[PDB]
Design a protein around this ligand. Structure first.
Ligand SMILES: [K+]
Ligand SMILES: [K+]
Ligand SMILES: [Mg+2]
Ligand SMILES: [Mg+2]
Ligand SMILES: [Mg+2]
Ligand SMILES: [Mg+2]
Ligand SMILES: [Mg+2]
Ligand SMILES: [Mg+2]
Ligand SMILES: [Mg+2]
Ligand SMILES: [Mg+2]
Ligand SMILES: [Mg+2]
Ligand SMILES: [Mg+2]
Lengths: 740, 740
């Protein structure tokens, strides 16, 4: 029953590792501070800092506005959680038999309605902090990356990567510490009722993904309205460089990288980490670990995350200290080495944890039955998710980097115009899904076989065990992106812009890899939650060949398309207005095209701000309302169908959308760099091939930055939301069938 | 027990209705022959005939080439069916107990192996005939429609529509008659073993869809390679009219309409018809109808189809006789009225048939049990499919006709360039899936609840009960497309082309509608076949939450994307070759752009011929091999997951792709016609808006004509293939699990 590592060791180990992670993060923010700049060569440093401030102000301003709406919605929804969950036992204050063991007595369900609302708000707040902190580091390091670019690629790379690491370790450590705290606080009330305790904790993931949904969508709309509008009028119509200070949309564009690609992404991944941890905990809570009250083994998922931070710490040193980039061709291999190193070290890490934090034999809850599991099997569950992640990263890099043929072929197809560029890009994205799906399927088979829903949850966490590194190589990208925009806006040398362009291109690839991990883990966690939901709702079998389940399956499969329709149309409409606005200033403001006059940046920011705040509402509504509407009107069988179908369907469109968009971007970068003869043959900038590439790039903008990455949230959010309201649905739901 | 309609009446009724349909088709073809031309103004009639002969030669030529390969594949695969089905009982010649009644003896499994091979070849040949006949009428009607356009749209409409009705009535009647004959011939052997009789008949739909798959994909690649190449160079680069006789790709483009949009589509719909009928027959064969040997009720689906032929005949008269089109805005409502009338009349026809051909009480096989079912409930099953169809057509028209807001806004977005046009078109397609899915889901729920798999199968057939009319309004479109092609190549009046453009625009909408009907019925029949497969394979329960089923689900959901990756890339690569070749002729043939030298049409025909014949193999292999590979390696429960997954997933991408392509085409047509102030302001032809619209149109070309429409075949083909091989898989499959 007991492991080698005693409960008190666990209670110490977790927050120690968290603090080590925060410590490391602050240490990296410190080093990045060594780069000095102020708005008070010398003219360059002053201009860079002025631009950084405009961006830092715009990003802070939008997030405050966005988080305001989202926080209000957060509060409203929390009221629904309390009400709906409280209504199950008529708000009784009396104890009841345990849902998991009739012979025992548990804390009243109304308590759980209360601690669920508590953990929901905890998660929601931690999610906003995750996004906001990320924006803070990014809007700090961007111009510092620009300035270090004067000294070479390797130096600007380090600044950007150190800064990515700040965000990665802060998110990973803060998310772990809040959960640890919440579990220990909650335990004070629950005592021996670990079932109710971890059922309450489940709201944490629900809160995390709930806020992330609006952050990803809202930020996504803001950024891509500007991106499309700036690039179309500037590069395609007016023949001026990307990020040219004459272009009124450039401030919104570069703000957008921080507000969407950074803030939205940070929340997103926090949601992933939280739901994965919660799912594991919820199944363990009614397995031998939870039933025999064994704290160490019970917190196996948090112990894994803990070691993950230390592993990622050692890994990061390989890129900041033990090596330096001399050639631009070294950048992408550097970033990929981060993944390989962490995966290898963490395979050793998890072996150790599995050896010391688990009994050699235990049981796992398996649809009403205690299944015999061995710790070496649980090691394989974690590890399969971990290696599936590496596989997914390798495949994604293959399809999105311009160092390989798929993207080079897409760039090449620009010789025959924008239409062929788009057909090839679409085809590439569709093609890209094949290996990720097999990886995910293999992970499911292995983990489902060994340890049912617990194994699957713990494979999700395995895929996210190295999340600090993952966030690092991902957050590195938009920082490099802003760095290039700043360089250009500060009229710096063409040689500076070339360095950042190389950093940026690698960042396009790592952003796609980040999305791969998000989609991979969302598939796994959603399946685990789905299985948990099925038990919690007292369903005997989810039989596909029943009218209730099947209509759910086909409708569930349709939801990701509905969601994508909304988000694509929003960006399209906003971008249309942006283009019309940028054109207006070019056509009416005297001397703007000449460099005489100043553009009005604030009107473009307003277009994307208005569009995002308004248009993020319906897609958020669709995802949040779906489980409630289906569960209440149609019942838990039909919701089971919806969950399965949205999972298997949404994953395809998510992967293809992200990779297509990533590919179009790097095909365009390929042409812009002119780093080979083939590349140079499609140039120079302004050529018909380059313009065709830009068309493809801007089509991919909403695909990879608005709809695409948000779909992983649509899937995991509905899953955890369904689990949380399961007792309510199973009691007060299925109405259309009760009355007819 | 017995129905009002006696068994011998049914035996007479069915073929009389087939003969009436064939007679009607010949009559209409006879009327169309009144339009005279020969290649022996007078110059205009002669030029039209020469162009018609070039197209006819090209189309007959490609199909002979394609059908040769496909026929060779068909003979190969027929052998596989014999061996695999034969091997289940070691090719024993001894009768065994009826699986549906242990007290009776049945014909040997070997007989069913033999007769399944026979029905497979029948369906395969019937499918090729359907496609070839369609091509023969279209390549006869095309120039006649052009000549009739001199007298106005109404006259040209009549010619095109009478001709489409020729194809529709031949296909519906020939498919019905062949099935009726095969059943009667097979009955000579099986006698009272109706289980084995109809199990053998299942090969008919298998053969139908097998050949359709290659017809749709091969023809699809052929036509779009040419279409994209012609349009991009001619319209976008060289600023010449669409279908300009100086353009070397134009002949291949117009041959393409006959070879894909007609021959491929004809085979496709035949497969839908065959499979839906076969699906209803198998379930009935072990329900009360087949067990009590009640021929009239057993042949209920064939009686529904027989009455459908007559209903469609009457409906046809409203468009050929009782009304004349006098203005362009009447074309679409006329075509829409065909759907409404046929549906209203067929509702009555089905009520009658349910009244006289069914006992008021009977039982339907329902996963091992006999479920009590009333004739009025079965009427609702057929009717709900019939009505789901109409809904699908109405919302598809809303999303693809430029008479409505969605497409006009797509056109409007061209004002900001090709990138916004594509974002809008993609969003439109995603958005379009919502209502059809709901219609399909409602159809499934109603029919599943009332009569299990039989009800579902019969709902699919209900959706295709008016298939003669469906084919007619669909086939009308490519004929009108050629008509304008010919008008332009013959150098006719601008007013002629304006008329054909109006006809052609409506054809874009009905083509989308036809795909809507194919997808809808594919979903229903695939579900029915999936349910049948499950029983035939002795699966107790398809439980979503098992490792074997779930990996099937997520992999199945990925196949439609893999399929689309291949077909999209094929068209893209072939189009790239086409663009290069068309550019070469304009750039190097002295006098070509001047109209004094003739282009080399044969070279473009060669490029799309070589690409299609080659590239149709891998997507065909993917669909055909998947059930074999999954069934033999992983087993029938995994295959269950694959069937469910490809169904719910493929259906979304099929609908969005077809409607997006349709919308881009008609958005372009709206600009090209300038029939309103808004349309005019996007023009004239050659404007940046028009060119942006052409870019979108050509991206939509492979989406709507190669990948999109073929996915309905991927879905329904795998379902029938799995049912046919079910006893082989159940017995000799799941190898990986057997060795480990
Ligand atoms: K990026
Ligand atoms: K058409
Ligand atoms: Mg951009
Ligand atoms: Mg950016
Ligand atoms: Mg940028
Ligand atoms: Mg980028
Ligand atoms: Mg971009
Ligand atoms: Mg065309
Ligand atoms: Mg055509
Ligand atoms: Mg045409
Ligand atoms: Mg068309
Ligand atoms: Mg076309």
């Amino acid at each position: 029953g007991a492991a080698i590592l005693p409960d008190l060791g666990t209670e110490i180990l977790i927050p120690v590792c968290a603090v080590i992670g925060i410590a490391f993060a602050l240490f990296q923010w410190l080093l990045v501070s060594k780069v000095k700049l102020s708005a008070v060569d010398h003219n360059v440093v002053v201009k860079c800092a002025e631009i950084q401030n405009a961006i830092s102000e715009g990003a802070t301003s939008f997030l405050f506005t966005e988080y305001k709406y989202v926080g209000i919605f957060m509060v409203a929804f929390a009221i629904l959680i309390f009400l709906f969950l409280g209504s199950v036992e008529g708000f009784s204050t009396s104890p009841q038999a345990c849902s998991y063991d009739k012979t025992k007595t548990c804390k009243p369900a109304l308590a759980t309605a209360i601690f669920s609302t508590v953990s929901f708000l905890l998660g929601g707040v931690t999610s906003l902090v995750s996004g906001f902190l990320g924006m803070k580091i990014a809007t700090y390091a961007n111009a510092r990356t620009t300035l270090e670019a004067r000294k070479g690629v390797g130096k600007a790379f380090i600044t950007a990567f150190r800064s990515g690491a700040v965000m990665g370790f802060l998110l990973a450590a803060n998310g772990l510490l809040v959960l640890y705290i919440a579990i220990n606080l909650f335990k004070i009330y629950y005592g021996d009722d670990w079932g109710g305790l971890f059922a309450a904790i489940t709201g944490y993931g629900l809160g995390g993904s709930s806020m992330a949904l609006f952050g990803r969508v809202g930020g996504g709309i803001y950024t891509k309205a500007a991106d499309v509008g700036a690039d179309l009028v500037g590069k395609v119509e007016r023949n001026i460089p990307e990020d040219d200070p004459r272009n009124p949309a450039v401030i919104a564009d570069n703000v957008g990288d921080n507000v969407g690609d950074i803030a939205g992404m940070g929340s997103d991944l926090f949601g992933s980490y939280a739901e994965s941890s919660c799912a594991a905990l919820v199944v363990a809570s009614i397995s031998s670990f939870g039933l025999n009250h064994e704290l160490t083994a019970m917190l196996y998922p948090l112990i894994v995350s803990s070691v993950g931070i230390l592993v990622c710490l050692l890994t990061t040193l390989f890129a900041t200290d033990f090596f330096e980039i001399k050639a631009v061709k070294e950048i992408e291999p550097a970033l990929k080495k981060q993944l390989v190193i962490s995966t290898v070290l963490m395979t050793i890490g998890v072996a150790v944890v599995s050896f010391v934090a688990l009994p050699t034999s235990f049981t796992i809850f398996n649809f009403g039955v205690q299944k015999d599991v061995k710790s070496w099997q649980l090691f394989l569950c974690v590890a399969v998710g971990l290696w599936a992640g590496l596989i997914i990263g390798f495949v994604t890099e293959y399809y999105t980097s311009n160092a390989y043929s798929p993207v080079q072929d897409v760039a090449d197809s620009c010789r025959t115009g924008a239409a062929t560029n788009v057909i090839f890009g679409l085809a590439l994205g569709y093609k890209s899904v094949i290996i990720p799906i097999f990886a995910i399927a293999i992970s499911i088979f292995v983990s489902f076989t060994f340890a049912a829903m617990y194994g699957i949850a713990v494979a999700a966490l395995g895929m996210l065990s190295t999340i600090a590194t993952g966030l690092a190589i991902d957050a590195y990208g938009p920082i490099s992106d802003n760095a290039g925009g700043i360089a250009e806006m500060a009229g710096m040398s063409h040689r500076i812009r070339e360095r950042t362009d190389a950093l940026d291109a690698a960042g396009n690839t790592t952003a796609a890899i980040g999305k791969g991990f998000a989609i991979g883990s969302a598939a796994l966690v959603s399946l685990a939650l789905f299985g948990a939901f099925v038990s919690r709702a007292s369903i005997t079998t989810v039989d596909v060949l029943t009218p209730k389940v099947f209509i759910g399956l086909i409708v569930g499969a349709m939801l990701p398309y509905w969601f994508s329709a909304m988000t694509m149309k929003s960006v399209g409409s906003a971008a249309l207005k942006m283009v019309e606005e940028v054109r207006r200033q070019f056509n009416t403001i005297p001397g703007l095209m000449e460099g005489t006059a100043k553009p009005d940046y604030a009107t473009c920011v307003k277009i994307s701000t208005d569009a995002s705040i308004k248009e993020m509402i319906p897609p958020g509504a669709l995802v949040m309302l779906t489980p409630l509407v289906v569960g209440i009107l149609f019942g838990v069988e039909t919701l089971s169908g919806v969950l399965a179908g949205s999972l298997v369907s949404g994953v395809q469109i998510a992967i293809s959308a992200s990779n297509t968009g990533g590919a179009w971007d790097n095909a365009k970068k390929y042409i812009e760099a002119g780093a080979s003869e083939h590349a140079r043959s499609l140039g120079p900038k302004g050529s018909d091939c380059h313009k065709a590439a830009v068309i493809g790039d801007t089509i991919g903008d909403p695909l990879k930055d608005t709809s695409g990455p948000s779909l992983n949230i649509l899937i995991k959010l509905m899953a955890v939301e369904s689990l949380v309201f399961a007792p309510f649905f199973a009691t007060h739901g299925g109405l259309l069938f009760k009355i007819f």
